[model samples]
Target: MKKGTVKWFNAEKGYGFIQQEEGPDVFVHFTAIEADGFRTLNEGEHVEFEVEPGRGGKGPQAKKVRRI
Candidate 1:
């Protein structure tokens, strides 16, 4: 897992971008969030997540994201 911050999110679309501590920004889809309660993300919120190859792009995406 890696530490990161949510740069922004689009609730309507259920997707966002996370700025990783030591890598390029990682894409985050709401389905990948590991929350058991409210399932939403806020801009500038801190979180931890794992990385996976992007589905239709070149950059990595954040998965299993949880607030920290």
Candidate 2:
């Protein structure tokens, strides 16, 4: 899993971007966060997740996210 922080997020939209330690920024959606306790993520929040390469025009999406 990739580790990173919430560089930006839109709570109203339930989506955001994570700045990964090893590569380019990743895009994260509300559905990607699996932990029931971390459904409410905010900007600057630290987290870890696996990044799946963008497909079909969408950018990198985070999966299996957990608060750090």
Question: Highest lDDT: which candidate?
Answer: 1
Cα-based lDDT for every prediction: 0.74, 0.71
Candidate 1 lDDT tens digits, 2-68: 7877788777897877786664767778787887686667788888867776541445666678886
In candidate 2, which residue pairs clash?
none
Stretches of model 2 off by over 4 angstroms after superposition: 54-59
Writing each residue's lDDT as its tens digit, candidate 2 over 12-55 gives 79787778665477777777777766574667778887777652
Against the hidden true structure, what lDDT does model 2 obtain? 0.71
Error of 1 at 11 (Å): 1.2
Q: Provide the TM-score for each candidate, comma-separated.
A: 0.78, 0.73
